[model samples]
Target chain A: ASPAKRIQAFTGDPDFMTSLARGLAVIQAFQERKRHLTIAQISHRTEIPRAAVRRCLHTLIKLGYATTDGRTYSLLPKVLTLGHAYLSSTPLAISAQPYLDRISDQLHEAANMATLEGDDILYIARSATLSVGGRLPAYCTSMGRILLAAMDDTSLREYLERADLKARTSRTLNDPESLFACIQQVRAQGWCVVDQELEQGLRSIAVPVYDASGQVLAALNVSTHVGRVTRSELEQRFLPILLAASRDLCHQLFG
Target chain B: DPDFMTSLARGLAVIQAFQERKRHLTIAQISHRTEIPRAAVRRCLHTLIKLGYATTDGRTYSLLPKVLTLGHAYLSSTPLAISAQPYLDRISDQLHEAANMATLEGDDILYIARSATVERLISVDLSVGGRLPAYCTSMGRILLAAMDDTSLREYLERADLKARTSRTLNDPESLFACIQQVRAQGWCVVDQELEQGLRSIAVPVYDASGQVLAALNVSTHVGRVTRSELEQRFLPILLAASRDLCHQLFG
Candidate 1:
């Protein structure tokens, strides 16, 4: 509700209320980096008055929809349930579940769908998959190599520039030039593998999965013990299965 | 480590400072209840005032609606509320009464989930996030029954069960008996215990792992429902409904 003909210059959105915009901004301010905040801090972050922020916080607390320590505010764990319901109930997750289950069952290895998040990868879904003896490294793992190989040139360059290229084992590829060469080959082949390069006796194979737009949504990978499958057999067997599964997932998502 | 817990404790002190006697308090009053230094409390109050969680009148500070946002987030998100809604609606439909799901927060039973029979059922605002004393409510008794001897003894030793009416159980020994009865029957019926004319019976709802996730209760007018009618008819219905829900949710 706005007052008659007094046009406020800074109030650009004729329809939107100032209070509502500020409130939504406050919600956005509670991102991962700014998890916990104080009133003055919120006011400073939002450029809103201290008094207005106090009013919103008080209302939120009384409604039993929010909790506070009294001075600073951090979102409660229950807040994640909102995001969880959306992710857990999505058709994508449901459709991918059986595929992942089948992959894991076939190889008795952990199968996962992961998307690159900055320098790290975030797991979106994991089949009843567990790592060999429960330990594995991100580098040299088939999934890790597949993801690295699939990155666009800029992201690939940035990752190579910053990451510590450590040798996890004797098989570790230490130099950037060598790593880039390895990535080129993996990209060309459309499949990647690592045999005890990241951790002793651990190996995996991975294939990239793309969305309908052909942009990489995530990568699917299966990790196992190198002792369980020889390098030659792994190349012939898992490479095809993972390649097919990734393609099947793409068809289901796009189709 | 930030020791977020201590920061959290100090924050709770700010909330704890607000009382019935003092809806709006000064910095000094806050320091007294919170046991923080006067300067620290003043700073917190200023931050809170700036944050819009509290208001200042130069002389006093009062809590605002912003606090409700956190609770709203929880009530809206938790699967318990969404899952319990339809089940409670069914219970209300069958019994022609209001059904609610409650969880213990501190010594109070916070009514996190509720399904009302009609538009206007009672004078009191019994909706989501409402709270009542744990001692006098059937849902409260159902939860209290889950505690062991030492915990229950401590709870009775600490609880304020002052009678709201002649029917209210104020004595610890009688309250203990009521809990024992609840354990034996696997349910509880409270008649005019919390308020004058409200009668309610509750059954415990468990998770798949057998943890008592919450208590579900059906409330009716005291005169409209007899105790035997509650046990013979309502109790069985409530048990079946709660069990089905637990299974559905657990699965």
Candidate 2:
């Protein structure tokens, strides 16, 4: 089989190496549902073949990111060092955390700081009401929508052309036309409110967090249950608070 | 295919050699730590740089944030940390203390979830995926107590039982006696055992069959709160939170 599109793209670059990509794939093979996986299981899951999986698994164990009971393999605490390296190196998330926490406290709701990554919004820091996954689709969540709104027309059009704008919920804008329309409104308004679009009962309001260059660096958001909060309340109550917080965060980060 | 994909393993090992304590390393340093040949280490470093997991400023190579994607794969996928998160947050909020959850991994305690309400009390930074010796921390002791006798014995046999602080139980018999007390009482408290002025108390979060799933703790500075205050104020709250987590986990 030909190499994956991602691998192919990287291979075309002067620096991209297949060995490192394979090693990362082996690490990714450990998913939420399967915490402990054998070499065979990982090979099957990643479709990377047993020999490669075994090598990567053993390497991970030797490196202390993984552990095994002579059979099944599970990730170790030291694996977090990889993330720590990233979170510590990227000052944006750490710098935004306290502000995010302040907003969460004041609003008594989950507040998040996210930046656009590809066609998705990657959560860098969050003062969360509940633990959340790392990624949100650009067309759905308020944070994503705000980020999407920040993109130039060409970039937005490129994303729209490539992204699968599948309906995540009944309230989701499945088609590109509706999503593009929503993005335009958010861009004009300078904020966004998404109600039950990403998931049922999840409603969020977001504002753009700016860098010193007047570019949208990330999106700041407050999320709540739709059953308890009305859209009018979100616009009237949460929007002002989020915008104020974002202003403070922007000043702190840029200045 | 090359046996053991030696190059792949060597590349990963190079990354691993750069840890929390030392964020950057010379090629010679990486070679010394990993025991890989210097040329092999050099090749791995070049590969890591090319792959964008590492970068260098003329000499010493350091890992980039992209390396975090490796751990993110596990954290984003696992439900353990997510399931325990709200409870940890509530505990940390209620007590205005650092609340943590850990599971026994080998002879070490691996912190799976944490809610840090207060500033640092211990020397080491505590976060999700941090590891500490199992004999000193309240969470570690509780988790160690959860293990079956055979497993516990094996742990004791190999564990170094380093004296982290004067209060640390450095001998296996003493540690075993303490673990037994934790097993009987259903809670464990360690005062300045892991580090001077760092105190903590933990209770077991259990599954439906009453098997210990994880140990949850509330940690504070000794100067801020006495051991008695921790027992009086934090114990009941910790136990209650643990019970709530048990229901959430197994119910």
lDDT of each: 0.66, 0.76
For residues A145-218, what per-residue lDDT tens digits would candidate 2 score against the true structure? 89888889988888887898898888889887888999999999999999898889889899998988999988
Model 1 DockQ class: incorrect
As for model 2, its CA RMSD to the true structure in angstroms is 5.4
lDDT of 1 by residue, A1-255 (tens): 121111132266433234433443455455432245788877776666788666656644543324678887754433322223223223454456578768877887778766554444545556642311112334456766777887887778778867777888999987778888888988898878877787798877778888888776667877778777887867888778888888898898787
B1-251 per-residue lDDT for model 2 (tens digits): 33446677777777767655344578888888889999878777776676567789978888764565566676655556666778888888887888888887667787778784634544665545557888888989999998888888888888888898888898888988888899999899999988988889999988889888778998888878888889899999988887877776567
**Top TM-score hit:** 2
Report, to 2 decimal places, the DockQ of model 1.
0.03
* Segments of candidate 1 deviating more than 4 angstroms: A1-255, B19-22, B117-127
Fraction of native contacts (fnat) of each candidate: 0.01, 0.34
For every model shown, the clashing-pair count is 45, 1
Q: If chain B of candidate 2 is superposed on the true chain B, what is its TM-score?
A: 0.86
lDDT of candidate 2 at residue B195, scale 0 to 100: 91
